[PDB]
Design a protein around this ligand. Structure first.
Ligand SMILES: CC(C)(COP(=O)(O)OP(=O)(O)OC[C@H]1O[C@@H](n2cnc3c(N)ncnc32)[C@H](O)[C@@H]1OP(=O)(O)O)[C@@H](O)C(=O)NCCC(=O)NCCS
Ligand SMILES: CC(C)(COP(=O)(O)OP(=O)(O)OC[C@H]1O[C@@H](n2cnc3c(N)ncnc32)[C@H](O)[C@@H]1OP(=O)(O)O)[C@@H](O)C(=O)NCCC(=O)NCCS
Lengths: 393, 395
């Protein structure tokens, strides 16, 4: 058991609607999206920007001309003082959780009292890259306009597409194509029900788009049927389980979670929505990277002195239906408490943004349900997992 | 109060850095991942640190410059034999990144989430791609689509619309630093690099790399035949009558470093040989328009936390992003020039964005020990308006 050195409280948690690839948010940079979530979080928590001592943003694939400045530009844009530092981190799909981890660490070593911890991705803006042309070409060479997004979805250390790591898990854990499609349908249904009941209202940071207000996830396909899913072809493997219907969507979006020490909550009269009770990051076999949430969630629980049975809500990012199902079977997760309002298959997976959304959703949904504990997690390309546990306040 | 010690003792048990390659030079075919791997392997070997003891891998890298870049820290960890269970994080605090990975490592150690951390920094600027934007979803007849130079556009801070060099010209104006004073500093960096290199002062830190076969173990960008008269003839690159030229700005370069840090408990458990102890560090924001001043609040804050003063520093390093930028820092803190950037810096050997902080730390670790000194502080300005500083103590 290892408790955080200091109490750390979530005092605001907001996330943008998620846009489809080439959809309604395609002309916003990852920096813009992060800005929108951060502004909404500051406003929802009534957190003065002046109070923020550190800015940390998760972002995976640099996708704008100003990308290397992301965290700093977000901080300055939302009125946080110029003296406040700003860090951009990349733990791939875990990035939106990892910014919160880094924030907790800075608070716990007394280097910060209030941290803006976001995650963002614009996958629509991922550039094509022309490599190896600065210093001359050779007649007859095959120069590519390389799709930075598509090539980033293969782990070159094991030469596997992400989807093929998920197929590896389907084989290993005896998960059928049909089971994957049924899970995919359930994510669409659960997203639809949640959306229509208002369960995304508190977390949602609406964005004005070219003028209309976007406040609904664009990728979701609430008219999906099992029959439709059954007809889709496997995309990556003959007779494979992974289709365009049961993989997470490519998407654009961001979130922002503001965390504060107990001292800061008292000093500034913040309203805590949750407490961060623990977290854990683990490496795992890159060839089955999708299993990361298993050691991540187990380790986090162990450090917190809790068990799975104590979790009222579990979130496992829906990178691929078979990937999620392998995690579910390995931990014996209770499906009535896991991804209760849908996930990335329905609303997409903006790489750096998903951890922030999942955390924001857990914070508000845990409170709505009157529950005590929740844990959010994601697998990470390259072979890692991350998990963050919250407790209601 | 202002004083603050690290929660746990954190020791440097290895510190290595690659030779730095020129833009389009000897290391141009190595990815930032490859370069980091070479530094990390060398550090593991020099510290006799078994890869199995490493609990976390943290790498600074600024501009993604290879098709595998988003995986960089993880690939480095796996390539050097660190267990698959060990996590891996890539961070970007721009030019401060190579210091920042060490800061993150210190934090993880101090909250007992790690005992031994591989903290590196790397950049391949030679590999920065051209980017084609806005063509996924159709084009419009008559639009002006660019093969955008990702490196060049990244050297302008779009929040204030200033090239990095122009923020340095802002400092030259503000602090009354002349073109001639800048060129004299630049000459001194070349001279100091040359003397250090020839005396063997980079030997302990150096992680040689086999290139196309020869062993590269000397910084490629350095121009030891530089004279003041040569520098005087160069034109200002960014501003009419400006101070900044190609001769007194840091070079574009490729290179990496690796610093392995360990808790006191790990040093004792594994019988590591500490080279230094991390005493303190600090990161501050500052005005983006004069981002080059970042080392001033960063160094001041770190010293304040550590209960030390500038007079206690046997060595000071301020990354030489631009001569006028460095000189504005020197004048603001009244640095002792006989103890500051003593063996040259980025004007001579170049500035691989993510790699410089790792090299500076590594150099301080070995040079402090060589001098028999007690304390050193390394620092860098950070595009966007930040600064970072790390203070070490000899063991
Ligand atoms: C699988 C993948 C390649 C598909 O991308 P895509 O082809 O642009 O996806 P689309 O939305 O265009 O769907 C393609 C087809 O499936 C159909 N389809 C998808 N979902 C459907 C649904 N729920 N119901 C009915 N049809 C559906 C689409 O309508 C389309 O058919 P059509 O062109 O005949 O109309 C992409 O989503 C992917 O790789 N996602 C995972 C990203 C990832 O790896 N992230 C990191 C995780 S670690
Ligand atoms: C200044 C800068 C644009 C110059 O790029 P560059 O012109 O390709 O650099 P070079 O090495 O080719 O030097 C250009 C010219 O100056 C000359 N030069 C440079 N240093 C010289 C020296 N020490 N003595 C004599 N000539 C020198 C070169 O010989 C060359 O002349 P040439 O055209 O006759 O061959 C580039 O180095 C830069 O932008 N550096 C800073 C990058 C940065 O901002 N990093 C982040 C810091 S915050």
């Amino acid at each position: 058991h290892m408790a955080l050195l200091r109490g750390v409280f979530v005092v605001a948690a907001k996330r943008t609607p998620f846009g489809a690839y080439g959809g309604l948010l395609k002309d916003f940079t990852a920096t813009d999206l992060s800005e929108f979530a951060a502004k909404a979080a500051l406003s929802a928590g009534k957190v003065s920007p002046e109070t923020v001592d550190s800015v940390i943003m998760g972002n995976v694939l640099q996708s704008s001309s100003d990308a290397i400045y992301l965290a700093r530009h977000v901080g300055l844009r939302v009125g946080i003082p110029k003296e406040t530092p700003a860090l951009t981190i990349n733990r791939l799909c875990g990035s939106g959780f990892q910014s919160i981890v880094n924030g907790c660490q800075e608070i716990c070593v007394k280097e910060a009292e209030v941290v803006l911890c976001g995650g963002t991705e614009s996958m629509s803006q991922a550039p094509y890259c022309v490599r190896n042309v600065r210093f001359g070409t050779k007649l007859g060479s095959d120069i590519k306009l390389e799709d930075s997004l598509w090539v980033s979805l293969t782990d070159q250390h094991v030469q596997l597409p992400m989807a093929m790591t998920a197929e590896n898990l389907a084989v290993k854990h005896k998960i059928s194509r049909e089971e994957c499609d049924k899970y995919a349908l359930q994510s669409q249904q659960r997203w639809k029900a949640a959306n229509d009941a208002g369960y995304f209202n508190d977390e949602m940071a609406p964005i004005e788009v070219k003028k209309q207000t976007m406040q609904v996830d664009e990728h979701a396909r609430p008219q999906t049927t099992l029959e439709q899913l059954q007809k889709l072809p496997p995309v990556f493997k003959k007779d494979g389980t992974v289709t365009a219907g049961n993989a997470s969507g490519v998407a654009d979006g961001a979130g922002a979670v503001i965390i504060a020490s107990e001292d800061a909550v008292k000093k500034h009269n913040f309203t805590p929505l949750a407490r961060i009770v623990g977290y854990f990051v683990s490496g795992c076999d890159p060839s089955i990277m999708g299993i990361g949430p298993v050691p991540a969630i187990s380790g986090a629980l162990k450090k917190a002195g809790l068990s799975l049975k104590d979790m009222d809500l579990v979130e496992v990012n829906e990178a691929f239906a078979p990937q999620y199902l392998a995690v579910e079977r390995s931990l014996d997760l209770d499906i009535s408490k896991t991804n209760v309002n849908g996930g990335a298959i329905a609303l997409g997976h903006p790489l750096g943004g998903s951890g922030s959304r999942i955390t924001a959703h857990l914070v508000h949904e845990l409170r709505r349900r009157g529950g005590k504990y929740a844990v959010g997690s994601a697998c990470i390309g390259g072979g890692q997992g991350i998990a963050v546990i919250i407790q209601s306040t």
